[PDB]
Amino acid sequence: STELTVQSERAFQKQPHIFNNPKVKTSKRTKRWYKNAGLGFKTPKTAIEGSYIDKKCPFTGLVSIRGKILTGTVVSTKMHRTIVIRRAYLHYIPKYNRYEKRHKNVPVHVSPAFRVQVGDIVTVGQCRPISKTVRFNVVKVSAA
């Protein structure tokens, strides 16, 4: 993540409809808005105390987690704020009464609240189409 140098983009990075009044002075200088995705997933401390914007984050963005919940191992982390996981399952062929290995690559979106490496086991939650191929958002990483 490396704090993503939050103001790298040409446009000002802000949370929509989150206005901090410069007239008054209050602690926590930058007012922040964060939500909980529900279903038992818990907001990481990075999301609450972070400085990124990432409007596609399930905890600080405008997206919501609903639908299928999937799990898989990270196989490609070379993009920006998006990784590819692989789901390994077994397919049953009823003629021979035995199974066979199969896999499916799923591109998922990872918030700056999470640091994922190749081999990390991550569970995801389905959201609205984030891009051409991304429909799932990283919601919890359970690997060390």
């Binding site: 040409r10 000002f12 009044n21 410069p22 051409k132």
Partner: protein, 187 residues
């Protein structure tokens, strides 16, 4: 016309999807407005299920809001000074959402005197009563009064001219103003 579907351009594996299902109407696109300044000429567009959509062209003015003071005034737009997406929109003075513009900035001055009364830049007893109540609240931030001297406050359009037919926005304040001043002042 313009299609918005995905049976065109290639799948995630690079494969070329074959022709299927001649273009349907419910996946249509339309020409961009490319809104300009002056001579307000807004053309209505009929959309799905009626729902008239105003394709604003050559818009003259708009409702701009002062976030700190919580007021909104109607001001003339002078021009476009910055646009994150493209510079050609700045050169041609195109008005789109999230475009930094300079506005008339006079109607905010008469409101400031009518509300606080002290000054900007540089009689009845009931007037001072309101002024006394609204005291020690005219020190908003130094970067804004300097703009009032030139009568052109920077602002960011928050409406979509080609979709709603209007052009509205807010006065840049605090970090937003600071961020866009190093962009403009850089040379």
């Amino acid at each position: 016309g313009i299609s918005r579907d995905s049976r065109h351009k290639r799948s995630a594996t690079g494969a070329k999807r074959a022709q299927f299902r001649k273009k349907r109407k419910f996946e249509l696109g339309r020409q961009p407005a490319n809104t300009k300044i002056g001579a307000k000429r807004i053309h209505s567009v009929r959309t799905r299920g009626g729902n008239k959509k105003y394709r604003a062209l050559r818009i003259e003015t708009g409702n701009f809001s002062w976030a700190s003071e919580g007021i909104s005034k109607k001001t003339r737009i002078a021009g476009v000074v910055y646009h994150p997406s493209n510079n050609e929109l700045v050169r041609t003075n195109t008005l789109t959402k999230a475009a930094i513009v300079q506005i008339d900035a006079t109607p905010f001055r008469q409101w400031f005197e009518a509300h606080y009364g002290q000054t900007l830049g540089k009689k009845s007893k009931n007037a001072e009563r309101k002024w006394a109540a609204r005291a020690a609240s005219a020190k908003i931030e130094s970067s804004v009064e300097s703009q009032f001297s030139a009568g052109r406050l920077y602002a960011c359009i928050s409406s979509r001219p080609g979709q709603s037919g209007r052009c509205d926005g807010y006065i840049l304040e605090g970090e937003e103003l600071a961020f866009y001043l190093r962009r403009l002042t850089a040379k």
